[PDB]
C-alpha cells in the first residue's frame, strides 16, 4: 500500500482506547490522507478527551497545532458532521511516536469553544490567532485579543467572505494610526495586555517596533522591577503577509513562491513540506533522484540558515567580526544555489512531482569546492568566537528550561533536543528518502540554554555537511520529475513536442492542476524547528485551506515563560539565541 | 529638466556659487549614511551587501547609523505592512533634510506578490521615493547600482547652501530613465548561455 | 572571579587578537563591483526578455499562458494576427515594479519566447518607467534556447509553412482522391 | 430505478441512459459524441464503463454508458482499471493525429478535448509516426474552420443536420480521412451555425469575431445578461 493512500487509522491504539472510555457513539473517525487519526469530538467532551489523552500510559504530551477552518463552502464533506466552522487540535505523543487530530464542529451562530489553555499553555496564542482570523470565541481565555491584526480591525480575514485583495490606501487612517502610536505610551494600561499591578514600583518599557538585526522588527512590552523583567507580553503581527489567505487565493503550482517566503532563511526547506503534502493529495510517489536532490537543497539551505544564526548571535553578543566571513561562506552556498536553481534566497524550484530543472553540468564541482571550503572556516569561527569566555559568560545560564517546559509550550528544533528529548522529524517520521542517509541527531543534557542551543546548531551544521557529502557521492541517475499525470509542470521537451503533454502543461499552468477532494498533512524538520503544512482540498485547482504551522510562533509564545525574572540584556541574548524570524511568526 | 518641491522649472545654475553647489553635491553623494531599518527579506540582502564579500564600504556607505537623525538615506527594504507603515512614516519624519529614499525589492516598490489585506501596496503611497530596485530580493550588487543611481541623482540636484540667503526650495532633476538609456544595448543581445551548464 | 578563570579569559582574548591579525594577513574575498563584473550562472533569474526564432521572427504567439501562470499578475498582452495567419502579441507589457523574478512565466512558455536572463542591473528613478513594453523586451536573437521554433511544431499554416510541412506531419490527402 | 456504481447505490431514471444518469449524479465519465440536446450514437467510444450481470460478478464487460439504459438493478463501475485503460486508449488514439496547436488555438482553456485528455490521465506519447493533415475552408465571417483539430466525434453534422435542419454542412471521406464541413468554400447558410463553436469539443469551428480580438476564457469578465 502506498504511503499517500486514504486511511482511517482504526488499528491505532488511541481509537480503541477512546472507544472503551467514551463509548463508540461519542466521536466520528474521518479517513484522510493526513497520516494521522482524525477524530471528530463533540464540543462538550473536548476537555474530557484532551485530559484523557494527557493521562494515557504513553500520553499525548504536546499540542502541536490549534486552528480553525471555514467549512461553509466545502462541497465534499461526506462522512463528516454538520459544521459551519471547525476547530482542529493536533496533538503529538513523542513516546508513542504518534499524533492525533481532534476536530470540533461549530455552527455559525454558536461560534464558541472551551479554552484549551488549562491543558496546554500554547493554546493561548493559538486561540488568539484563531479568534483573530476566524472570529471563534474561546470561553475562559485570559486575554482573547487580536494577535495578527491591530485591535481596531473590522472583520476576520481567514473567513471565506473576507476580501483577500488589498483595500484602497487612504492617508486618513495612516494619520489616525500615527496619532494612536504617538499616544500609545501616555494612554497605556496594563489590563488590556493581560498584566496586573502596574504597586507604583514597576516601569513599563516598550522595546520599539523597529529592531536593527536580521531577526525582524517587532515589539515587546516589559514590566520591570528595576532591571528585572517581572512580566512581558510580545506584540506581534507587524509582519503579517496573509500567506494562508494567499493559499486559498493561488493555485497549487503558483503558491510555491509564497511557500518560499514563510521563513526567508529556509527557501527549499520551506518548499519541502508543501510539495510533499500536495504530492500526498495527488497520489504522487517521486523517484529517488528527486528525493536526493531535494535533500541536498534542503541541507544547503539549512547550512545557510545555521551560519546566519551563529554569526548573528556572535554579533549580538558583541563580536561583530565573524559575520562577514560567515556571509562569505553563505556567498559560496549562494553560488551553488544560483548555479542549480537560478536564484539566491527564494529559489521557487521544487515542483509537484519533482524539480523545475535537472542538475546543471558542473554542480558536483561546485559542491566539492564548497565541501572543501566549509570545515576550516567552521573551526576558525568556533575557536575565534564560540570558545571565547565573554560570549560563553553572556550566553550560558540565560533563559534555561527543562523538557517539561519545552513539551508544554510546543518548543521544537534545537531547544527541544537540547532538553534531552531526541525527537527529529528526519528520523522519527522519515520523509523524502531521509532513511537512506547516514547522519546523527545531536541532543542536550536536559537544560536548553543559549550556548547549548548554539552548539547544537553547530553540530547540526556538521551533520548537514555529512549529508551533503552523501548527496554528492551518491546521486542517482534518472528522472527529475515523476511519471504521474499530475506532475506540474510536465517535462519541458515533451511539452514542446507532444500534443498530450502540451495539453497537460496548458491546463496545469493556466487553470491549475486538479487535486481530488481530500486532506493531507506533512511535517518536516525545518532550519528553525518543526514546520508543517496542512492542506484541505475541495476538489478544485486551489487549496481550500492552507494551514502553516511554524516553530517560531511557539518559541515567541514561550518567551515570557522563560525570561520572567531575568534582565534586559538576558532578554536580548535570548532573542538572539532562538533562531526565529518574524515572517515565520506572523506568516 | 528639473522639478520643484518647496511644477517643472529649468536649471538656475556666478560661477563660485556653482562650484560651491557642486562641492556640496559631491560631499553629499560621496558620504551617504544609510539607516539600519529592517523589514523583511530585502534587509537580509541589504546586510549581505554590507558584509565582506560585497563591501559597500568602498562607497562610503558602511557607517550605518542606528538613529534616523544621523542618517541621510532611508532604504525601505521589505514589505510595508499595515502595522509597520506608521512606524515607517514616523521614522522618515524623524529624519532631517536632505533625505533620500531607496525602495528595495518588489514589496517596497509596489507591494510585490502580496496583494493582501494587511500590506500597503508600495512605499510610495505615503513617503516619496527616489530610487526603485526590482527584485525579490535584489542581489547586493543591485543595491550597489541603486546607490550609484542615487549618487547620480544627488550630484545634479540643487539645494540651498544656507537658510540665511538664496532660494529655499529643492530642485530635483527629471532624469532620463535607465530603461530608455539601456535600450540601445539591451535589444542588441542575441545569444545567451543555455541553462543546462554551470 | 577566580584567578584561573581570569587567566583563561586573558588567553582567549589574546588568541582572538592573534586570529584577527592572521585574518588581516590573509587574501581579500571582495568582488570589485562595479569594476569587476558579477559572474552569473546561465539560468540566473534576472531581467526578462522576449526572444526570436532562428528565422528572425519573434517567438511569442500571444497564448497568454505566462500571464495566467504569473502569481503576481504582472504580464499584460493582447493577441494580434498577421495576414498570413501568424499569431503575435499586439502589445506585451510587464510591471517590473511587481515582478518577483520567479521564472514561472518562462516555465509556462510553450514557445520559449519569454526568458529570464542573467542581468540584475535594473534600478529606476520613477516607478512608471518600471513598466517595460514590447519595445523594451524584444531582443534580436534567440537567447538561452537557440533552435526551438514553435511554428515548426504546430499544425497551423503560416507564411512559409503550409499544411503537411510541419514536423511529424503527413501531406494532406483530399477526400476526392482516387486511392482507397 | 436502482443502479450501483462502484459499490454505491443511486436512484436514477430508468428512461435515461447511464451516461446522463451518472453525470446527473456528479460522477465523471469522459464523453465526446453524446450531447444532452442531440442524443446518443456511440461514436467516440469514450464513455466506457464496466457492466456486471449481478452483484456477485467479477468479470463484467466494457459497455457504452451513453448507449446502455439506466435500468433498475444495474451494476456498473467507472473507476475499474480496464475501463480506465480503455478510456485512456481512446484519448491516446485521438491524440495520434492531433496537431501541436494549443497555444495558437482559440479553444485553448475552453477545450473539451483538453479536459477529457487531462481527466483520463493521458500525458505520455508513445506514438512516433506522422499525423494526418487537412486543408481548411472558408465558412464565412463568423465561423473559422480548422480541420486538423477534428476528432471525428460527429457532433457538428448531428447538430447542424439532425437538429438545426441545415443542408450545407456534412461529412466526407472514409477511414481516418473523414472531413467535416461544406462541399465548397462559402458562408454557412444556417441561422444557428454559430452554435458549432460550442457543439464542437475541439477548435475546428471557432468564433472568428472573437478570434479577431482574442483572449482566453480565464481572462474574461462574464456577466449573466439577456
Ligand atoms: S520583495 Fe521578495 S525578498 Fe523582498 S521583502 Fe518582499 S517577499 Fe521578501
Ligand atoms: S518571473 Fe514570476 S513574477 Fe516575474 S513575470 Fe514571470 S511569473 Fe510573474
Ligand atoms: S507563454 Fe510564451 S508564447 Fe505564450 S503569451 Fe507568454 S511569452 Fe507569448
Ligand atoms: S482543439 Fe483543443 S486539444 Fe486541439 S489544439 Fe485546440 S485547445 Fe489544443
Ligand atoms: S469538427 Fe468538431 S464537432 Fe465535428 S466531428 Fe470534428 S471534433 Fe466533432
Ligand atoms: S459518449 Fe458514448 S460513445 Fe461517445
CSV table of C-alpha atoms in Angstrom, one decimal, chain A residues 249-250 253-255 257-258 260-261 321 324-325 328 331-332 335 338-344 346-349 351 356-360 377 379-385 387-391 481 488-489 492 495-497 502 505-506 509-511, chain C residues 5 8-17 19-20 23-24 26 29 31 38-46 63-66 68-73 98 100-112 116 145 148-150 153 167-168:
chain,number,residue,atom,x,y,z
A,249,UNK,CA,-6.0,32.7,-3.4
A,250,UNK,CA,-3.4,30.9,-5.6
A,253,UNK,CA,1.6,25.3,-8.6
A,254,UNK,CA,1.6,29.1,-8.1
A,255,UNK,CA,1.7,29.0,-4.3
A,257,UNK,CA,6.9,31.3,-4.3
A,258,UNK,CA,4.7,32.1,-1.4
A,260,UNK,CA,9.5,30.3,0.0
A,261,UNK,CA,8.9,33.5,1.9
A,321,UNK,CA,33.9,40.3,13.0
A,324,UNK,CA,31.5,38.9,7.5
A,325,UNK,CA,33.3,35.6,6.9
A,328,UNK,CA,31.3,34.9,2.5
A,331,UNK,CA,28.0,33.5,-0.7
A,332,UNK,CA,29.7,30.2,-1.7
A,335,UNK,CA,26.9,30.4,-5.8
A,338,UNK,CA,22.4,30.1,-8.1
A,339,UNK,CA,24.0,27.5,-10.4
A,340,UNK,CA,21.4,24.9,-9.6
A,341,UNK,CA,18.1,26.8,-9.2
A,342,UNK,CA,18.9,30.2,-10.7
A,343,UNK,CA,18.1,32.2,-7.6
A,344,UNK,CA,19.9,33.1,-4.4
A,346,UNK,CA,14.0,32.2,-2.7
A,347,UNK,CA,14.6,29.6,-5.4
A,348,UNK,CA,11.0,28.6,-6.2
A,349,UNK,CA,12.5,25.4,-7.6
A,351,UNK,CA,7.7,21.2,-8.2
A,356,UNK,CA,11.9,22.7,-12.1
A,357,UNK,CA,15.1,21.7,-14.0
A,358,UNK,CA,17.7,19.0,-13.9
A,359,UNK,CA,21.0,19.4,-12.1
A,360,UNK,CA,23.3,21.5,-14.3
A,377,UNK,CA,36.0,28.2,8.3
A,379,UNK,CA,36.8,25.6,13.0
A,380,UNK,CA,38.1,29.2,12.7
A,381,UNK,CA,34.7,30.7,13.8
A,382,UNK,CA,34.4,28.3,16.7
A,383,UNK,CA,37.9,29.0,18.0
A,384,UNK,CA,37.7,32.7,17.4
A,385,UNK,CA,34.3,33.3,19.0
A,387,UNK,CA,35.2,29.2,22.6
A,388,UNK,CA,35.9,32.7,23.9
A,389,UNK,CA,35.0,33.4,27.5
A,390,UNK,CA,32.9,36.6,27.2
A,391,UNK,CA,30.4,35.1,24.8
A,481,UNK,CA,10.2,14.7,-12.3
A,488,UNK,CA,3.2,20.1,-12.5
A,489,UNK,CA,4.6,21.2,-14.9
A,492,UNK,CA,9.6,20.6,-20.9
A,495,UNK,CA,5.6,19.7,-23.7
A,496,UNK,CA,7.5,21.2,-26.6
A,497,UNK,CA,6.9,18.3,-29.0
A,502,UNK,CA,1.3,20.2,-24.2
A,505,UNK,CA,1.0,21.7,-19.4
A,506,UNK,CA,-1.5,24.1,-20.8
A,509,UNK,CA,-0.2,26.3,-15.8
A,510,UNK,CA,-3.4,28.1,-16.7
A,511,UNK,CA,-6.3,26.8,-14.6
C,5,UNK,CA,39.0,32.0,35.0
C,8,UNK,CA,41.7,31.5,30.7
C,9,UNK,CA,39.9,34.7,29.7
C,10,UNK,CA,43.1,36.6,29.0
C,11,UNK,CA,44.3,33.6,26.9
C,12,UNK,CA,41.1,33.5,24.9
C,13,UNK,CA,41.3,37.3,24.3
C,14,UNK,CA,44.9,37.1,23.2
C,15,UNK,CA,44.0,34.1,20.9
C,16,UNK,CA,41.2,36.2,19.4
C,17,UNK,CA,43.7,39.1,18.9
C,19,UNK,CA,43.4,35.1,14.9
C,20,UNK,CA,42.0,38.5,13.8
C,23,UNK,CA,42.7,37.2,9.2
C,24,UNK,CA,44.2,40.6,8.4
C,26,UNK,CA,45.0,36.8,4.6
C,29,UNK,CA,37.5,37.9,-0.9
C,31,UNK,CA,34.3,41.4,-5.5
C,38,UNK,CA,29.4,39.8,-11.4
C,39,UNK,CA,29.6,36.3,-12.7
C,40,UNK,CA,26.1,34.9,-13.0
C,41,UNK,CA,25.1,31.3,-13.9
C,42,UNK,CA,23.3,30.8,-17.2
C,43,UNK,CA,19.9,30.0,-15.6
C,44,UNK,CA,20.1,33.0,-13.2
C,45,UNK,CA,16.7,34.6,-12.9
C,46,UNK,CA,17.2,38.3,-13.7
C,63,UNK,CA,-1.0,32.5,-26.0
C,64,UNK,CA,-1.4,34.2,-22.5
C,65,UNK,CA,0.0,31.2,-20.6
C,66,UNK,CA,2.7,33.3,-18.9
C,68,UNK,CA,-2.0,33.4,-16.0
C,69,UNK,CA,0.9,31.5,-14.6
C,70,UNK,CA,2.2,34.7,-13.0
C,71,UNK,CA,1.4,34.7,-9.3
C,72,UNK,CA,1.7,38.5,-9.2
C,73,UNK,CA,-0.3,39.2,-12.3
C,98,UNK,CA,5.7,44.0,-9.3
C,100,UNK,CA,9.4,38.7,-8.2
C,101,UNK,CA,11.7,37.2,-10.8
C,102,UNK,CA,10.5,33.7,-10.1
C,103,UNK,CA,10.6,32.4,-13.7
C,104,UNK,CA,7.1,30.7,-13.7
C,105,UNK,CA,6.4,32.6,-16.9
C,106,UNK,CA,9.5,31.1,-18.6
C,107,UNK,CA,8.4,27.8,-17.2
C,108,UNK,CA,5.0,28.2,-18.7
C,109,UNK,CA,6.1,29.3,-22.2
C,110,UNK,CA,5.3,26.6,-24.8
C,111,UNK,CA,7.4,28.6,-27.4
C,112,UNK,CA,10.3,29.6,-25.1
C,116,UNK,CA,14.7,35.4,-17.7
C,145,UNK,CA,17.2,28.4,-26.3
C,148,UNK,CA,13.4,25.9,-30.9
C,149,UNK,CA,10.7,27.1,-33.3
C,150,UNK,CA,7.1,26.6,-32.2
C,153,UNK,CA,5.8,22.0,-34.3
C,167,UNK,CA,7.5,18.0,-38.5
C,168,UNK,CA,5.9,14.6,-38.0
